[PDB]
Design a protein around this ligand. Structure first.
Ligand SMILES: Nc1nccc2cccnc12
Lengths: 19, 341
């Protein structure tokens, strides 16, 4: 499921701004 | 008539904003006015700490920026933007700047303490919000962006990490680190990867329409539990964003998908919020048909939940962070660069 893919991804924590 | 009232409200709001924009407050407290309690969040420039103001006993969130780090990161003008704008704005869903000052080492912005934690924390824990709950939060962002944009301000860092829940269950936007007052287009590469509009990624001039794109990303993430474009490498996120494709969970209502196709529109000439009707293409969309915009502004709508509160100065709705001792150098750093702060 897309949710399972999200939860296993490296991007579920707080996301830093870019610049 | 409703639209004329909004017009008149924003006109008076701009008169008040510009008075403070042109004559910013400066140096309205000092560090030893506060007892430092606990770190509430971290960032590249510094940290936000829970503090107690000694003379009143009020709790505040004090954002601390290391001037030398701000310079190294080429964020001088953005940091001046952030404080000049925050001290001038006034809206129910914008965190209130109460004091600001600087010393030899750091910049300090002292805000009203919002005790209910980041929306990010509640969203990750519960998984996803129902559409009524997501609509309740989204409506507040719609009104906040209508306010900011009317003042020629672009926010540029919308995400759940920056939306705090207050004791009434309503949203307070914090972190104006990328907020900018601009009438033309602008060009700075800034934001958070999942929320970047295509025109930012592609190095085009852009305007307030990037905030409405980001609203589409936020509403999607609130209602789905994951953002519309994600991957472990930022480059792959950008490839998804510019591709023009987006898929929706099967539980997304028909109205929600139609709203999101118009917000997550790669074509600036078709993106809701950037058309002839401005924000009213959003406010009048069927997905918002039950939203009482005035009642939301007046905080008269029952919230989806009220965060838990053990007492004043309680931080249980926030993660724990490693504490670092705030040091102030004997020598003034970067004085010229931050003279107006
Ligand atoms: N105004 C605030 N209140 C509580 C927590 C906060 C965390 C980061 C930034 N601002 C905050």
């Amino acid at each position: 499921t897309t949710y399972a893919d999200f939860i296993a991804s490296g991007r579920t924590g707080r996301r830093n701004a870019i610049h | 008539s409703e639209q004329e009232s909004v017009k008149e409200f924003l006109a008076k709001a701009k008169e008040e904003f510009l008075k403070k924009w042109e004559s910013p407050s400066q140096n309205t407290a000092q560090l030893d006015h506060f007892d430092r309690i606990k770190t509430l969040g971290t960032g590249s420039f510094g940290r936000v700490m829970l503090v107690k103001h000694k003379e009143t006993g009020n709790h505040y969130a004090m954002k601390i920026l290391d001037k030398q780090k701000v310079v190294k990161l080429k964020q001088i003008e953005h940091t001046l933007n952030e404080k000049r704008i925050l001290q001038a704005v006034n809206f129910p869903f914008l965190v209130k700047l109460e004091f600001s000052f600087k010393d030899n080492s750091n910049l300090y912005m002292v805000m009203e303490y919002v005790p209910g934690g980041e929306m990010f924390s509640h969203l990750r824990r519960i998984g996803r919000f129902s559409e009524p709950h997501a609509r309740f939060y989204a409506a507040q962002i719609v009104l906040t962006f209508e306010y900011l944009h009317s003042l020629d301000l672009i926010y540029r860092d919308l995400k759940p990490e920056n939306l705090l829940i207050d004791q009434q269950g309503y949203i307070q936007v914090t972190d104006f680190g990328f907020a900018k007052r601009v009438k033309g287009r602008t060009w700075t590469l800034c934001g958070t990867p999942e929320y970047l509009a295509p025109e930012i990624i592609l190095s085009k001039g852009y305007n307030k329409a990037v905030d409405w794109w980001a609203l589409g990303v936020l509403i999607y993430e609130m209602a789905a539990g994951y953002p519309p474009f994600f991957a472990d490498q930022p480059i792959q996120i950008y490839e998804k964003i510019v591709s023009g494709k987006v898929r929706f969970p099967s539980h997304f209502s028909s109205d929600l998908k139609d709203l999101l196709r118009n917000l997550l529109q790669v074509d600036l000439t078709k993106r809701f919020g950037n058309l002839k009707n401005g924000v009213n293409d959003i406010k009048n969309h069927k997905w918002f048909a039950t939203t009482d915009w005035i009642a939301i502004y007046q905080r008269k709508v029952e919230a989806p939940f009220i965060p838990k509160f053990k007492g004043p100065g309680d931080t249980s709705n926030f993660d724990d962070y490693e504490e670092e001792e705030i040091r102030v150098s004997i020598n003034e750093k970067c004085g010229k660069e931050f003279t107006e702060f």
